[PDB]
């Protein structure tokens, strides 16, 4: 339900007509909560604009997957393409939004989300290109790693990019990195401001119109 | 002629070869060519690809049989055997950001001496790269990646070897076709010339040296 | 809604604009958009294109009406009026080797900071370029070319703005589509979504801002 | 006739299966003289592999031209493509032969063929990429310019490239640039060795197996 909380709030950030990229895992849930009046198009780095939901049983195509190799559909008007074209869209400023998972985000807005030394070494894939190139980067991530704060003063894990991400959404808070530091914009209806601050190591600026939502 | 029996892989893929292999997590990968490499235990390979697929398929079969000395890839997280060999030091892994990998392979294919990319600046990827500033912004100079043979997968070839791809099986295949010295295409169907239109072909037959399957 | 009347070009292309215009010697050029620019005397333009076509067609019409302050092109030999204005000093001409032009426009479209090419080394093109040596071979660093608006020509658009091209009318058009801030596509036919397959579309509708017929 | 002499001899240099690019002017005549057993494919820089001869009257297609904008046909199995792909074929080493016209060629095998200061200023087009990238460059030109030698010690006209071209074919001579200088391999049956050397400012190395032909 923390993952559902995050996915619902991220989906409310998306705007009509946007091309959106969802990372595997938590970000992929966002596609299940798009407000009905909101039409977006999804891109997968392995080479499609127009990704649709998983096919009904028997409608799978071996050549049509997401970036985790799971079967997907393609919606009418989709385009498929090679990996150079794909990262031309991503790196070239043609992707409106990427929603990516997170291990840490710091008060510079820097994201670490591809490696934990001595623990998980999956490689970066497209994540460095996505954070560098997307017009908007949204980090969708639980607030802590079994209690340990993930919003920290300075990342200790390897950086994905030096670009400042644009939004952090956790199950407890919505935070916008700014030139002054991290601006807390919203907190969850099921939490309190005191709890958020207890579980955030980074310094947070508080917006005057702090909202409740996610 | 271009179409050859799969046993011809043994003549064309040398022990120690540097290979570009198409496929994204095994989708659009030349499975029959890989199986022949396995059958003849062709080893000490350097494989350039998006990933090492999974333990049970595609490039992951090469890793499972310890046929790679080195992989140059963007992602290994779905293959624990790749990670195990990396940690033990028997497999060298060069991680390359996926978009950079595409452009580095493409640079070799289209005759460039390198490209500048903002991806990786200020990360561990910057280690041992020339940094070039242009208009106040920093870029990494990333260098062309060459190979002996490109092992690519396509949906159809016509009699001349023109290729089309299918959906997300395209990925790295047409890029690698331009970049390696020799190109071997594994195809699902051979169709008559004139079945693939000039407007839809993605890899011209002139750059395809051999076809199998 | 992407589709607008052709007479809206005067609202979208400003005096002094930097424009990429598709077409090879007028083949695959947005002739109706060009005619709108002429009709409305939209002047002081900087035009990035392969060439200035002929005095009677395509980009050549813009030069004939003295609407260009500057052209950035690979070739002008088929337009004596371009040559005359260059010699008299009223038109600035920046000559760019055609393959370099393609890659410099592409670099802007795909987010690169530049590319290294061997073309032009040791010629007058080397003047005022950074020279980079890679593996004992010299390359010119060539920088991305940006523009305010791309004026491109395509064969068909579907309802979503996905584009296909036709034969040698493709040339620079899909490259320019990636590289400019705003993209206006002149198309010959609007077709239903689903007429253009995912395997054949060459420019996705998401990057096309306006369409005219 | 000298243009025919040259085109016939150049055509004899082409090999089965090659991709060939012909420049405008004299090289385009080569297509008229391909030996009947020799099957090659032609590339045009404006974006085609598989160029054919001019269409019969009424069969023209406005979108299908050569690099002079003249109507061409496309042969079965042709591919058309954008200008970046086109110069990937050209610059990337995928073009087996380019046959190009010449203003000068010098003892280093350097070609000048795109500009005469104060006279012809057409721009370079694709010529620099073609000389730089073709696996083999054949220069098809008349031996002199109204009597002035065009094969010179050092080019005085602007270079197209510093690449060493591979073959020069004139109406008088076939010359191969080498590390040692220019190797005269053949002279025309209608000339003499002395006439060839008198109309060449560059030093020539005379092959011990000098041949007659073109
Ligand atoms: C994408 C990514 C950044 C996070 O994955 P996700 O699906 O998007 O979200 P999750 O919350 O489930 O994080 C995945 C795991 O990494 C762990 N993790 C997350 N942030 C961490 C951090 N800063 N330090 C250590 N572990 C961390 C989580 O505890 C979680 O562990 P578990 O699933 O095995 O119990 C990875 O990379
Ligand atoms: C290089 C290129 C211009 C040559 O053209 P071509 O058709 O292949 O062969 P040509 O012999 O007819 O040369 C064309 C013209 O350039 C001239 N020319 C050729 N080499 C020259 C040189 N070294 N100096 C001056 N003029 C020269 C020729 O005299 C000819 O002049 P013309 O048109 O008045 O008759 C091509 O493009």
Numbering used by the authors:
A (entry chain B), D (entry chain C): 2 to 215
B (entry chain A), C (entry chain D): 1 to 213
The authors write:
CtfAB then transfers the CoA from acetoacetyl-CoA to acetate to reform an acetyl-CoA and produce acetoacetate. CtfAB is a member of family 1 CoA transferases. CtfB contains the acetyl-CoA binding site and the PS01724 signature sequence which includes the catalytic glutamate residue (E46) sandwiched between two short antiparallel beta strands on the N-terminal end of an eight-stranded mixed beta sheet. CtfA contains the acetate binding site and the PS01723 signature sequence.
Similar to other CoA transferases, acetyl-CoA is bound in an apparent high-affinity binding site in CtfB with most interactions occurring between the phospho-ADP of CoA and CtfB residues far from the acetate binding pocket. The binding site for acetyl-CoA involves primarily CtfB residues that are far from the catalytic glutamate where acetate is bound. For example, E46 CB is 25.5 Å from A146 CB. The adenosine base of acetyl-CoA is wedged between the methyl group of CtfB A146 (chain C) on one side and CtfB L158, I117, and L104 on the other side, shown in Figure 5. M121 extends the hydrophobic patch deeper into the binding site to make hydrophobic contacts with one methyl group of the pantothenic portion of CoA. The second pantothenic methyl group is positioned to make hydrophobic contact with L104. These extensive hydrophobic interactions are likely responsible for the high-binding affinity, but there are also several hydrogen bonds and electrostatic interactions as well. The acetyl-B-mercaptoethylamine group of acetyl-CoA is modeled only in the heterodimer cleft between chain C and chain D. In the chain A and B heterodimer, only the phosphoadenosine group is included in the model. There is 2Fo-Fc electron density for the modeled acetyl-B-mercaptoethylamine group between chains C and D, but the density includes multiple chain breaks and is weak in places. Interestingly, even with the acetyl-CoA group bound, there are two acetate molecules in the acetate-binding site. The shows difference density for two acetate molecules in the CtfAB F42TS45C-CoA structure. Acetate 1, colored magenta, is the only location where acetate is bound in the same conformation in each structure.
